[PDB]
Amino acid sequence: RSNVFAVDSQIPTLYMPQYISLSGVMTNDNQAIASFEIRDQYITALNHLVLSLELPEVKGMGRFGYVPYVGYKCINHVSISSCNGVIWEIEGEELYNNCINNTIALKHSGYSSELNDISIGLTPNDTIKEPSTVYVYIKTPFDVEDTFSSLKLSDSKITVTVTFNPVSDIVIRDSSFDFETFNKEFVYVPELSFIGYMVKNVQIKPSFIEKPRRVIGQINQPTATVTEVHAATSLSVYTKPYYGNTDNKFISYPGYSQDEKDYIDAYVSRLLDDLVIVSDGPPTGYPESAEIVEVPEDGIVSIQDADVYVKIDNVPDNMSVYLHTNLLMFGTRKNSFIYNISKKFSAITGTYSDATKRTIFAHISHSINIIDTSIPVSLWTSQRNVYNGDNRSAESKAKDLFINDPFIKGIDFKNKTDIISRLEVRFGNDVLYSENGPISRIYNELLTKSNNGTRTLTFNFTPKIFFRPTTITANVSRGKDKLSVRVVYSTMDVNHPIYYVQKQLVVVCNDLYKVSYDQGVSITKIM
Amino acid sequence: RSNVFAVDSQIPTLYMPQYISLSGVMTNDNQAIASFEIRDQYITALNHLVLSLELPEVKGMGRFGYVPYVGYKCINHVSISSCNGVIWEIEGEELYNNCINNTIALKHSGYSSELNDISIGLTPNDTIKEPSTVYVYIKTPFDVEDTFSSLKLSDSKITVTVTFNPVSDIVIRDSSFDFETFNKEFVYVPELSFIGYMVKNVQIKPSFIEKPRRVIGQINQPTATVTEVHAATSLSVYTKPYYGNTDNKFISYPGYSQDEKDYIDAYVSRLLDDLVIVSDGPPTGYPESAEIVEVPEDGIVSIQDADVYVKIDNVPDNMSVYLHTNLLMFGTRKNSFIYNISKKFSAITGTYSDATKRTIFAHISHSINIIDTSIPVSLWTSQRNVYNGDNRSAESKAKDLFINDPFIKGIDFKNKTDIISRLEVRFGNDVLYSENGPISRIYNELLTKSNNGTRTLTFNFTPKIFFRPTTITANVSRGKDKLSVRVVYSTMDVNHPIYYVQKQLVVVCNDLYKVSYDQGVSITKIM
Amino acid sequence: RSNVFAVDSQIPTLYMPQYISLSGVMTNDNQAIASFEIRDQYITALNHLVLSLELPEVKGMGRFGYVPYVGYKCINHVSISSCNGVIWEIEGEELYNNCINNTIALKHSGYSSELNDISIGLTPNDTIKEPSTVYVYIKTPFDVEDTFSSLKLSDSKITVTVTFNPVSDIVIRDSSFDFETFNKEFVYVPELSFIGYMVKNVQIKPSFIEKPRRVIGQINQPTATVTEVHAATSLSVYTKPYYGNTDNKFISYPGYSQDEKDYIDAYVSRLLDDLVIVSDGPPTGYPESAEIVEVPEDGIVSIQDADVYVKIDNVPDNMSVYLHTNLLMFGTRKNSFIYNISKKFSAITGTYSDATKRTIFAHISHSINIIDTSIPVSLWTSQRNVYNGDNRSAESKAKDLFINDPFIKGIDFKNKTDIISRLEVRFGNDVLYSENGPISRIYNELLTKSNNGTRTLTFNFTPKIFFRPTTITANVSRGKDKLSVRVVYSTMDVNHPIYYVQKQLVVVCNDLYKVSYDQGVSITKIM
Amino acid sequence: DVLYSENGPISRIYNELLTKSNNGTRTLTFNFTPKIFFRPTTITANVSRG
């Protein structure tokens, strides 16, 4: 019988851990580049990289806030290298995707109302944000098994390089705020920490490491090819919107609240102040193409086939209730189908307030989805719209927000709508895999316990670190050495504005590399 | 010293994983049975069964919604068989209990506002729900250690059989919905996927598997016995309500919001429309047994010992405020204690709406608990009641909902009230265990890290897969080969309607089987 | 090649677990002490201690609730000892910190609206709380690897001793509650349970155990020394507020709701009913020092540099709106900077209610931080304040709560403000560690996956149980055998009241002990 | 296993070219061997592999 009540406890190697902190050198196209140098004869290994960033005090007029997880969203590229070349690198989007299921790391990255609320400054000496520090946990392959997976420095010099994105990407601002001045005065101040182990008489053996490599297809192509595939552990596909032909303007953003219903509530709340207007006589200050109609005594307004129920309480006798009936409208020919945002409301009730001279809306019933809130403002006034398009007031136009969030997936902020209806992977000339439903994403989420998985073929099911991972292997003799991905996008109605958002296909392939310690640290591609 | 800075990496078995999808054969009281045939000599192993279901478009009038986790709630029975007989099978209730701590799984099964809101249709060709797909993760014993525990096929054919519940179980509807037509045109459309491993030169060894078996006691009996118990790893006990002598109709259901406070707010908001009435003179349209009392000027109405504070703002000059003082009442003798739902309110404030002719309630103080929310409507009008019992309007009665949720435990929807006061397990003639408080449920939740455990005796604490599980073993010489459970139910007040809900005792015993691979897969019960 | 599709199942030791419940002997400055004797020749080992407590019915008038996690907040000290002396013991604060990442355990220890809502009784016979039972999971070092790490009883008698905190610690009450009567008749009723193992032919070997050891520095000293350090696994530093120079009264507590926003909204809710008063003529019932100013028809009141926007709806024509402009004020010299709570508000909007003769508030704009919610009432009226101080009504003064919660950290209830600005740890005369930012807290939270970590130096990274833990070892020959800690407190403004809250420095040292089984259970100190 | 997949009517273009017809259908042709004088070539089942 095997003993389940006792173990012979082994004695480990004698070591001593230490928290180490280094400051960096900043250098300046004109992208920020920080270089850190780790040189110490007594540091045998390291892992658990942490980057700290000091955010400066922000003053002036306008509305200003930071994007969620700013610390992660700032990193464009990371590089650990030695005398023999690059040991490991990753793009910002692969790092964020790997850290998406670690909620404590996301909390330390910067997720609070003090940072992420859209604050207002009313005077040139107002303080919008107090100074604070954020901490980015750079999750690496070196963390899986604690001491077992640490990076061994075979007495060589290791240098770490962090490339930052430009500061316009991580800031959410409107047009009143003086961005060119904030951009002229902003500087990144980084610091790097890691755990070092001082080990007596270490005996190092070689190990394996995976380096992600991504390829971005051309605009609107339903294809993308990954070349030079010799040992891949997985393959993942998703789409990114490209907003370069726009001004990057969006109507609203909810800030710290991140539920889908929070996004929808923020959109409805921004429109309601322009939808129902209480005024003396026909309302003024809107473009002439707006057809605004007074509500009859029975309280029902019919817009073609749609019925809107409008009941406002405590309205003074010398005032009326008006309804904007074509707030946003899109069409391609003058008497065909119309996408009309005001037809998506069915009941609107509320109470007017005579103290503040505005209407406080109560319960709303609507069918608004995330896509309407995710349509960029410039698509409403494009040259292909045969109607005017935007009949909002100028005061409301001044509340629009520039958003250059770099890690948006799908065609909405939450990646909820699935626009890939069929996927086909080809290895050489033969069909490796095809699917009609998102069954490979269901499998990815079950296997990794994540809420935001992607379409992933996983080829490795072997326990980490203690075994050589299993791979799909090229057969150059038979021509199998490239992975072609081809999708068919879902069909949408040409009168919905989202048909004209441009899309890109992103393929990610994890290659397997061999780490060796013959005269310094070196890596070798496995073939 | 043991090295904690290096590992000799093992080369694993050479293999290739593959996603496979099958379509099934459908067969047809007249419950649907689907059977899928898996035949391929190169699929050596499988695990991670996922079942997909197509839900159709729903048209017509009435109120309609799906139960939460509809994909799981649809499965009545699953069987996996080969040429030698049944390998494994489970009831839908045991499957749901095994999957109740997997939040990712429950999310994929279909839990969202678009499926689970109670939607209203107004016109015969209105679309209530769009078509959508749900995914049911059939958790099996083969998933514990990934590749280690997978089901080995020894060149034999494998068959999977899924029996579905009738569609009345998964729909929450009112009386206006045309159920015989929906039930006549609804069909289940299933598809099965799994991960297959192609293994070169596989070396199979025998394993161990746990097969659940359930026994149902008679109505209202406090006993149950499992015969032929030779090697059990655990023993579970819980209660189910039996609504078969009723029409299964209830007053409210909260839908997507699933907190206890949400159940109470939904129930209170269903009652409030009938509780405080603003009328011109005594309100009409109510049964004669209603006791409607005008509220005095100081705002206090006394119902015997209870005081109700009623303050309503902006009431027009030609109107008064009335209070229904016996909305629901139940009693067994004409001068004993009375259960009265009107006495559970203490303060009622709100404001009147001139535009919509209704009250918008603002702040309520009450002591309503979950049991009032879980009392079926038909118990109020039972022949035991010496009072009329139900004094709601007919318009209120027409909005009631049919609910046939099959996996409800306890006597309330959340299994919160513990109605088992004492438990006694007998092995042969000796008292194995007995308890008063729910200390064994506390242990079950600590040991499995679940929020919804049951009273469970666990006999096995050895790490899974790598050891033969520990069991309680029969002593046939002494005659100890059956487990009889006896409970004592907690006493309730004879004037509470919940005392007359009928209960069933359910006992679940996990037996141990030996899997062997001498010419195909076979199981043998251990003696 | 290693087989990853099969394994040889080891037969474990033959055993039989059993749930065992014991009753205690209560004994009695006047702190309750419960002693339990475990003596039965057939129990070989135990773990998983659970303590149950019956809380009695509470009757009378006044406001009364329980602190969150009553069961854990009640325990002052735990000791397990045999005839040879103490085997293990821990203080209540270290136990709570060890179990703070276990949400299941916190849920069983008592966290619900039934217990934690602040209830009101109106007559001397009103029942405030129903009797209920709470469960305290006493997490031990014997739980890491289940059966592998369980405490073996080598035929000796084991005694468990629970020392209770006085009932004043776990109760939140106002002044109208009869505390001395409740305290005279309250009685702790404990019962202990554990899981025993009947083992045939057990084979016992010595193991390793860690005993936390606490040291508390003097009041307001920035230093603290830990003597007799020969093998420490970690070192922790934090601060506790000391309220001994006050009466322990606070303005608000949110009860069941535990978000930081909930703390703030409860504080604002208590202030707003006194901030804006609707009255016919100058409001009465305030101290002579109050400067109450009428709000002009324009709606803007200017208070020095601050501008307050006040808009109240539905105010009757014969009444006016007044604003309390110095509700709480603190200063140390007569014409310098002033901390004024009225200037922390910028916009106040709401609607008047003619039924309840009070204001229902709508949108509020404020800058209240958790420190304002965490200032004791005694500090506003201290002898160093050169102003009167508290111009609130006596009706508002009667709703303050006594709170003696024993495990508060930081200087606010949520441990959000970081008041330690620099930390230096000395080992002998050499600096072992120094830091400016909270990098050691970031590492503690990443490594333990908690949200309430402390500043911790960790020295052990080897897998538990199977390896002997790694320690920092004393060199008494060179004199390095003590751990000194020195902090510098962050500078605060001399006109903020929090500058005068007294602080204590807490150091926690985890000492390593060896457990041996040569004739009974014994421990030795590692040197 | 996927034997064949196509997005455009390339198998119908091939059918029409190979049989000189104006009204072909989507056809996988497995036999290209002269008629009658040879045993035609076929795609053959492998019941062992399903």
Side-chain angles (χ1 to χ4, degrees), chain A residues 16 18 56 68 118 123 141 298 327 357 381 391 419 436 448 470:
Chain A
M16 194 63 196
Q18 187 183 317
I118 317 299
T123 298
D298 65 333
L327 189 68
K357 267 288 187 67
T381 59
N391 290 330
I419 59 159
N436 288 283
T448 82
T470 294

Side-chain angles (χ1 to χ4, degrees), chain B residues 461-505:
Chain B
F461 284 87
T462 332
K464 292 183 209 182
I465 291 312
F466 305 100
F467 289 91
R468 181 197 143 176
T470 294
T471 56
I472 182 183
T473 63
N475 201 297
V476 47
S477 66
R478 197 172 292 113
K480 302 164 66 173
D481 64 312
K482 66 168 55 60
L483 287 166
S484 63
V485 167
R486 164 176 290 276
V487 302
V488 168
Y489 292 117
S490 70
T491 305
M492 293 186 267
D493 186 300
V494 72
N495 297 301
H496 198 309
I498 201 56
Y499 176 91
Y500 301 97
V501 174
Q502 291 175 320
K503 310 151 292 292
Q504 287 184 294
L505 193 75

Side-chain angles (χ1 to χ4, degrees), chain A residues 1-21 47-50 102 104-105 107-108 113-114 135 137 146-148 193-195 197 314 352-356 360 462-463 467, chain C residues 2 4 10-14 45 147-148 150 152 197 199 202-203 205 208 260 309 311-313 416 433 437-440 442-443 445-447 449-451 456-463 465-468 470 472:
Chain A
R1 292 172 183 271
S2 320
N3 197 350
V4 296
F5 279 92
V7 279
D8 186 329
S9 84
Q10 304 161 75
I11 317 279
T13 314
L14 188 56
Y15 72 93
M16 194 63 196
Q18 187 183 317
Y19 303 163
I20 280 149
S21 270
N47 62 4
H48 281 108
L49 264 52
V50 177
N102 190 336
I104 62 170
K107 185 68 170 184
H108 295 154
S113 46
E114 296 106 5
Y135 304 87
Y137 172 41
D146 292 288
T147 51
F148 286 101
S193 309
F194 57 89
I195 308 171
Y197 308 87
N314 191 5
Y352 183 70
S353 173
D354 214 338
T356 49
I360 319 299
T462 300
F467 290 87
Chain C
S2 316
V4 285
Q10 311 147 274
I11 299 105
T13 315
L14 192 53
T147 49
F148 285 96
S150 44
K152 280 97 178 166
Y197 300 93
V199 192
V202 80
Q203 312 291 332
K205 298 168 188 166
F208 288 101
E260 158 208 359
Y309 185 69
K311 281 302 180 181
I312 310 295
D313 271 302
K416 163 143 177 296
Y433 180 68
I439 182 77
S440 60
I442 296 293
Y443 272 123
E445 285 174 4
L446 281 176
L447 300 165
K449 302 157 201 283
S450 150
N451 303 88
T456 307
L457 301 174
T458 310
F459 308 124
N460 183 27
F461 284 92
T462 79
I465 294 309
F466 300 103
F467 291 90
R468 172 197 153 122
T470 296
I472 183 187

Side-chain angles (χ1 to χ4, degrees), chain A residues 244-296 298-382 384-393:
Chain A
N245 65 317
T246 79
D247 65 343
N248 270 99
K249 180 171 284 178
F250 296 86
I251 276 159
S252 74
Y253 197 73
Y256 176 55
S257 311
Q258 287 292 310
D259 275 328
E260 158 193 333
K261 150 193 74 174
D262 296 327
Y263 273 89
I264 288 173
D265 286 336
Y267 187 71
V268 160
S269 64
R270 281 277 281 115
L271 302 170
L272 280 177
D273 316 329
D274 275 356
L275 202 64
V276 181
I277 307 139
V278 170
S279 91
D280 187 354
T284 47
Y286 290 96
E288 295 81 3
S289 303
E291 296 164 346
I292 292 175
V293 158
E294 197 189 312
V295 177
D298 65 333
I300 296 145
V301 183
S302 298
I303 321 171
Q304 284 87 77
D305 59 303
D307 283 8
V308 187
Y309 181 76
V310 189
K311 280 307 195 189
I312 306 306
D313 269 306
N314 191 5
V315 168
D317 290 322
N318 62 320
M319 291 185 153
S320 304
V321 182
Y322 294 83
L323 176 73
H324 203 322
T325 56
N326 62 326
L327 189 68
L328 303 158
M329 69 176 298
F330 188 88
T332 55
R333 76 200 198 103
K334 255 300 175 172
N335 290 284
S336 157
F337 175 83
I338 297 165
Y339 193 78
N340 188 339
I341 210 67
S342 55
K343 271 144 84 54
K344 316 182 82 70
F345 291 83
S346 74
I348 298 170
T349 62
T351 316
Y352 183 70
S353 173
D354 214 338
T356 49
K357 267 288 187 67
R358 56 157 304 192
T359 292
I360 319 299
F361 292 101
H363 163 70
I364 317 285
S365 280
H366 61 80
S367 47
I368 303 292
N369 47 43
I370 185 79
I371 291 180
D372 181 65
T373 80
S374 285
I375 309 188
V377 181
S378 38
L379 284 203
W380 287 107
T381 59
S382 55
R384 299 177 302 286
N385 191 6
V386 287
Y387 298 103
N388 174 59
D390 193 351
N391 290 330
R392 299 176 295 149
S393 71

